[model samples]
Every structure is written in C-alpha cells, then in structure tokens.
Target: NVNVKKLLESLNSKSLGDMDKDSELAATLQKMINPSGGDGNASGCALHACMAMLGYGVREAPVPNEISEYMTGFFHRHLEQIDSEGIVSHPNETYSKFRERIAENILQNTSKGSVVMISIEQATHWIAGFNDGEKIMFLDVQTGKGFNLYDPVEKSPDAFVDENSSVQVIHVSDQEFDHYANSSSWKSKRLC
Candidate 1:
C-alpha cells in the first residue's frame, strides 16, 4: 500500500522548481524542483530516478546520499562472481555494442521492474528506463520526464548521448528499498 500511495504522489506531477519549463517540455515532462544553485543536490538525480523506477514520490529537498548510493553500493555488475575470462566487457567497446548490452539486459530481466540509468554526461544524472515485455520506456530523472520510445532503434534521450557519458543500467525491484523506505536514510545521510 505504501507504493500505491507513493504511486499517486509520483503520478501527481510538479513543476521544475525554477527551470525554464518551456525549454525541454516538448521532449520531456517537467517533474523536478529546480536542482540548481548551492542547495542544488547534483547527485540527487539517481535517488529520484530510483524512486521513480521503484514507484515512489519525487522531490528536490532532503537530498539523498543514501537511496541511490545505497542501491549502487549493493547492486553493481561486477559484484557478481568474477572471472579472468572477462564477464563485463570494456577495452574499446563500440557504442552500438554498449547499446545492445543495455537492451539485452533489460530484455532478459523485464521482471526486475525499472532499470535505472546512472550517468555522468553533463554531470551525475540518473534516469529511470523501464521496459515492459521488451518495450522500452525511458524516463529522464533530472526532470522526472518520461518518453516512451518503445523501439530501441529509434532515437531519443532515453538512449543517452554518444560518448564521454556512460550509463550504468541496473534492474531492481521495489522491495529491495524497503529497508530505507520509512527510515531517515531514505531522505538523507546527514543522520548517519
């Protein structure tokens, strides 16, 4: 029932704090609280994206170092059984290959819910990309905007940029965050 409550709140929509709503509105839906200035929480994108993917509310205050970081700390690719034979590829992998990798992961684990995309293109911005039975729905976290680009081959911000910015695609269920959902760590790590 918590997620249901969170779902309604997340569905209720909010303005982009102080951002130029007219700018990217055609391409995205405004849903942040103006993440600029000193109070601006740069890494805040990830937590909200995680929340969005996890079907939870979104806000700008009480920045999170816990939710996303906590998930990132727990859910990582290399964290699995390691091998010298190369499990996750690197060494000059092409962008197309990288794109295919994301698709395959999502297609294989569609049951995991949202696959949050953590990137550092312009900065550490996290995105909530969801695929249902193989259809991709990309959600940009910085603005809480979602674009349903079902066809992975089609172009959209859902795919992210060309280079210098890498996105970590992680598939997780809502229950994984249950521990911090009702705790102080859900809001901020300051209490830590």
Candidate 2:
C-alpha cells in the first residue's frame, strides 16, 4: 500500500527547484504535472494535479486540507443544483450542454497554456482529470503509480468515458480551489 503521510512529508520537504535532482521527488512532482500522474490521495488528487499544472516554480501551493474544505463548501452551496438522483442539474441548461461548455472552456484554456481540471467517476468515487486537448487524462489519487491514461472505471486510457462511467469537464480558476468553490450552480450526483 502507498504511504500517504510519507508522501506528504516528501512533498513538504522538497522545494520545486530540488525536484530536478531528486528522482523520488521528481516522480512525485511529475504526478502533479502530468495528467497521467496522481499524488496518491483520493480526496486531494485534483488539487495536487492542478498545482502541478500551475507551475513547478510556484512557491506556495494550496494543500489538500484547503482543497477538501473548499470542495466541501462548494458542494454544500450548490446542493440545489444537484438532482435527487445525484447528478448535476443546471437551472437553465441540460447536463449535456453544460458538459460541452466545460469542454470548450478546457480546450480554450489548454490552448492558452493553462491546465484544466475535471471531475470524473472512478467506480463509485469521484476523481480529478486533466485535459490534454484530444484526450482527457486521468489523475487518479488512489494509485501510487502516478497518472495513467487509463481510467479506473472504463479501464481505458483513451476513452473519455464508458457506458458504466460519467465524466464532466469543469472550469476552475488558477487562484486556488477555494476561490470559486462557493460561486457556482454546477453540481454532481452524490457519491453513494
């Protein structure tokens, strides 16, 4: 099993500049930078991945605690945007349209050299995704192997989603997960 506490410790100890020389640290950093990477914590995987996307040179990054708190608060505020069945329901648009808008935004951001974060179903749980143009890369936190093109749900690296899974491209600013956490009508079904 992966030892998360140790991973966090390593993350805390290493400066971004040191990553180039330390293979272990570099590997962890890679997981944060690449869509095929994961930081080994299911709850904060997305934020870590996003931090990686922001830039290795970034000195101060948001920790998982803040990310989880922000996400929780965001969910609470948007509870009304969710359906009884646990899917996000926008008041003025269909889910498909919302997804399209998110996708379009991701593509646009990527083109502008920005990393896009997405929410996806990994079996019964939700995880973060990274957009790399034509493909939606899975940044699963449960695996210690870092990011893989393969999604746990569909078992495919190239597939956006399968019949058994659902994915929603989400747009978030670079200012930290909390910045936009409480300002949306976007919702997803409860992970039950």
Query: Using lDDT as the measure, which candidate wins?
Result: 1
The regions of model 1 sitting more than 4 angstroms off are 1-30, 33-43, 61-101, 117-125, 143-166, 172-175, 187-192
TM-scores for all candidates: the values are 0.45, 0.41
Instruction: Give the TM-score comparing model 2 with the true structure, all chains together.
Output: 0.41
Write down the worst ten-residue block by lDDT for model 1. Answer: 18-27
lDDT of 2 by residue, 141-171 (tens): 3343332223443222222333423444444
- Residue 179 in model 2: lDDT: 55
lDDT of 1 by residue, 1-192 (tens): 223234324433555421222123312322343243222343344454455445554444244443354544544443332212221434455534554565566667565455444332322344455544444445444443443212235443334434433444544445555654775545552211
Clashing pairs in model 1?
17-34
TM-score result, candidate 1 = 0.45
